[PDB]
Design an enzyme around this catalytic site. Structure first.
Site, short mmCIF file in Angstrom:
data_model
loop_
_atom_site.label_atom_id
_atom_site.label_comp_id
_atom_site.label_asym_id
_atom_site.label_seq_id
_atom_site.Cartn_x
_atom_site.Cartn_y
_atom_site.Cartn_z
N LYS A 1 -1.28 -37.26 48.86
CA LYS A 1 -1.87 -38.34 49.87
C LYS A 1 -0.85 -39.03 50.27
CE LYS A 1 -2.43 -41.28 45.60
NZ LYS A 1 -3.49 -41.92 44.72
N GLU B 1 -10.15 -37.99 53.28
CA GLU B 1 -9.57 -38.86 54.12
C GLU B 1 -10.46 -40.22 53.80
OE1 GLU B 1 -9.48 -40.47 58.50
OE2 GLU B 1 -9.21 -38.31 58.33
N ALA C 1 -9.82 -45.02 53.68
CA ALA C 1 -8.95 -46.34 54.09
C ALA C 1 -7.35 -46.34 53.53
CB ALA C 1 -9.67 -47.56 53.47
N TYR C 2 -7.56 -45.58 52.31
CA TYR C 2 -6.05 -45.29 51.72
C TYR C 2 -5.44 -44.39 52.70
CZ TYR C 2 -7.90 -40.66 50.66
OH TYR C 2 -8.58 -39.41 50.78
N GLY C 3 -5.89 -43.82 53.16
CA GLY C 3 -5.21 -42.41 54.36
C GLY C 3 -5.48 -41.20 54.00
N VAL D 1 -5.43 -37.26 52.08
CA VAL D 1 -5.35 -36.36 51.10
C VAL D 1 -5.35 -34.88 51.49
CG1 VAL D 1 -6.19 -38.15 49.40
CG2 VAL D 1 -7.55 -36.09 49.91
N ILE E 1 -8.08 -32.01 52.45
CA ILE E 1 -9.18 -32.28 51.41
C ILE E 1 -9.98 -33.23 51.83
CG2 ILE E 1 -9.60 -33.26 49.12
CD1 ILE E 1 -7.24 -31.41 48.10
N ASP F 1 -12.84 -50.71 38.97
CA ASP F 1 -13.60 -49.78 40.20
C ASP F 1 -14.28 -48.54 39.76
OD1 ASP F 1 -15.05 -49.81 42.77
OD2 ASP F 1 -13.17 -49.20 43.72
O1 LIG Z 1 -6.22 -40.37 43.94
C1 LIG Z 1 -6.76 -40.28 45.01
N1 LIG Z 1 -7.19 -39.10 45.44
C2 LIG Z 1 -7.00 -37.77 44.76
C3 LIG Z 1 -5.73 -37.64 43.80
C4 LIG Z 1 -5.60 -36.33 43.30
C5 LIG Z 1 -6.38 -35.28 43.61
N2 LIG Z 1 -6.47 -33.95 42.87
N3 LIG Z 1 -7.22 -33.25 43.37
C6 LIG Z 1 -7.95 -34.05 44.30
C7 LIG Z 1 -9.25 -33.61 44.86
C8 LIG Z 1 -9.63 -32.41 45.22
C9 LIG Z 1 -10.63 -31.84 45.78
N4 LIG Z 1 -11.60 -32.56 46.17
C10 LIG Z 1 -11.47 -33.89 45.82
C11 LIG Z 1 -10.43 -34.45 45.40
C12 LIG Z 1 -7.55 -35.44 44.25
C13 LIG Z 1 -7.79 -36.70 44.89
C14 LIG Z 1 -7.43 -41.25 45.82
C15 LIG Z 1 -6.69 -41.35 47.22
C16 LIG Z 1 -6.18 -42.74 47.30
N5 LIG Z 1 -6.02 -43.12 45.78
C17 LIG Z 1 -5.84 -44.30 45.39
C18 LIG Z 1 -4.17 -44.95 46.15
O2 LIG Z 1 -3.43 -44.04 46.51
N6 LIG Z 1 -3.96 -46.08 45.99
C19 LIG Z 1 -2.71 -46.59 46.58
C20 LIG Z 1 -2.91 -46.84 47.99
N7 LIG Z 1 -4.09 -48.04 48.35
C21 LIG Z 1 -4.33 -48.29 49.64
C22 LIG Z 1 -3.15 -48.24 50.67
C23 LIG Z 1 -3.33 -48.49 52.02
C24 LIG Z 1 -4.78 -48.57 52.63
C25 LIG Z 1 -4.93 -48.62 53.89
N8 LIG Z 1 -6.17 -48.98 54.14
C26 LIG Z 1 -6.22 -49.47 55.31
C27 LIG Z 1 -5.26 -49.10 56.60
C28 LIG Z 1 -4.14 -48.94 55.96
N9 LIG Z 1 -3.72 -48.51 54.63
C29 LIG Z 1 -5.67 -48.62 51.39
C30 LIG Z 1 -5.56 -48.53 50.26
C31 LIG Z 1 -5.41 -47.77 47.45
C32 LIG Z 1 -5.07 -47.51 45.99
C33 LIG Z 1 -7.36 -42.70 45.21
#
Ligand SMILES: O=C(Nc1ccc2[nH]nc(-c3ccncc3)c2c1)[C@@H]1CCN(CC(=O)N2CCN(c3ccc(-c4ncccn4)cc3)CC2)C1
Length: 345
Positions: free
Chosen positions: A47, A26, A28-30, A32, A24, A142
């Site tokens: 994800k 990509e 910083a978070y990783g 999906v 789907i 945010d």
């Molecule tokens: O929730 C999220 N995505 C998401 C969820 C459910 C979905 N259902 N359907 C979709 C969809 C379907 C079709 N088209 C688009 C979207 C969908 C998308 C995003 C992905 C990430 N999330 C935030 C999150 O999980 N957090 C915990 C981890 N955090 C984190 C962890 C590590 C890094 C990181 N950065 C650099 C290097 C290593 N790790 C960065 C942020 C950020 C907040 C927001």
């Protein structure tokens, strides 16, 4: 019968429950993916998070998990499942399983004109979700189009609580040009002036920016750097009033604003000549310079623009506020382990 599935190089180690993965997105978070859930017989989002590198990634991972597991609301994305290894030793990735959606408001706005009826419904759902968040004494911090998910029938869910905080209005004051993390175009003017972004009014600003963006498909304040952001904001709101300026006690912030040539307000109806006049009245109240005078989420829901949808009895609040950094690497990893334990066999 099994053997780790992979997508765009990444291991996706989520079987046997979840199969038939497809990419789907990509960030910083990783990564999906979509996946077929063999228990509920529906495709889901999954994800892959790999944060055990630095404790900022673990912090954002902990906030995401703790907040989304405690919230239960139609306009907020849930967590359905979390996959990780059975021991802390063996745990390197965390997979978070969520309802599959069709798109997000960022992707939609880059391609699609919104009807005024769509704008109104989206805004209603945004505010309905935010009422619940704010009722739990939480700030999202945010809000932006990319953090608003949409399914095929335009139901909206707020996502990404990695930058959320518990509100703390008594400790919001700070100095001028204090650095900040949340997304530049959606930052209220007070962030650049004297605010740590610990008040509910930070989120209302962001929603205001979203509303403007739904009206024209263009971000309303697209600044190219920290202080440039304030200058876009003042370009449209005009110079702040004496009264609004007097509220900024910090001298560096106040004298900066006094240094600027007078600028007149740009009328909303000239920026958005196709907009509903009720929409622009609510927009005005959301994009108020002075955060104390800025409309609150429950007032916004009661605004004439949203009259077709407003029903406070169907706009639920959280059962209890949240009251959940100074925590070592090892302890943050243990807490992510503990928080995810409910999903293990
Ligand atoms: O929730 C999220 N995505 C998401 C969820 C459910 C979905 N259902 N359907 C979709 C969809 C379907 C079709 N088209 C688009 C979207 C969908 C998308 C995003 C992905 C990430 N999330 C935030 C999150 O999980 N957090 C915990 C981890 N955090 C984190 C962890 C590590 C890094 C990181 N950065 C650099 C290097 C290593 N790790 C960065 C942020 C950020 C907040 C927001």
């Amino acid at each position: 019968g099994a053997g780790p599935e992979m997508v765009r190089g990444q291991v996706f180690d989520v079987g046997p429950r979840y199969t038939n993965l497809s990419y789907i997105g990509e960030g910083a978070y990783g990564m999906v993916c979509s996946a077929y859930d063999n228990v509920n017989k529906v495709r889901v989002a999954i994800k892959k998070i790999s944060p055990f590198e630095h404790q900022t990634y673990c912090q954002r991972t902990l906030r995401e998990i703790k907040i989304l597991l405690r919230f239960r609301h139609e306009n907020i994305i849930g967590i359905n499942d979390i996959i990780r290894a059975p021991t802390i030793e063996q745990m390197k990735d965390v997979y978070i399983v969520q309802d599959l959606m069709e798109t997000d408001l960022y992707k939609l706005l880059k391609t699609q004109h919104l009807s005024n009826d769509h704008i109104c419904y989206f805004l209603y759902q945004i505010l309905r979700g935010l009422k619940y968040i704010h009722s739990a004494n939480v700030l999202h911090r945010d809000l932006k189009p990319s953090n608003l998910l949409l399914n095929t029938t335009c139901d909206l869910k707020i996502c990404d609580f990695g930058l959320a905080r518990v509100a703390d209005p008594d400790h919001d004051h700070t100095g001028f040009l204090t650095e900040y993390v949340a997304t530049r175009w959606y930052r209220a003017p007070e962030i650049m002036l004297n605010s740590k972004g610990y008040t509910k009014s930070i989120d209302i600003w962001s929603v205001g920016c979203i509303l403007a963006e739904m009206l024209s498909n263009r971000p309303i304040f697209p600044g190219k750097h920290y202080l440039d952001q304030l200058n876009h904001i003042l370009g449209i709101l005009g110079s702040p009033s004496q009264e609004d300026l007097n509220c900024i006690i910090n001298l560096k912030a106040r004298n900066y604003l006094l240094s600027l040539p007078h600028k007149n307000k740009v009328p909303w109806n000239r920026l958005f000549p196709n907009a509903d006049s009720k929409a622009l009245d609510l927009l005005d109240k959301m994009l108020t310079f002075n955060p104390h005078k800025r409309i609150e989420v429950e007032q916004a829901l009661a605004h004439p623009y949203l009259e077709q949808y407003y029903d406070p009895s169907d706009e639920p609040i959280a059962e209890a506020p949240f009251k959940f950094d100074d925590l070592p690497k090892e302890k943050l990893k243990e807490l992510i382990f503990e928080e995810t334990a409910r999903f293990q066999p």
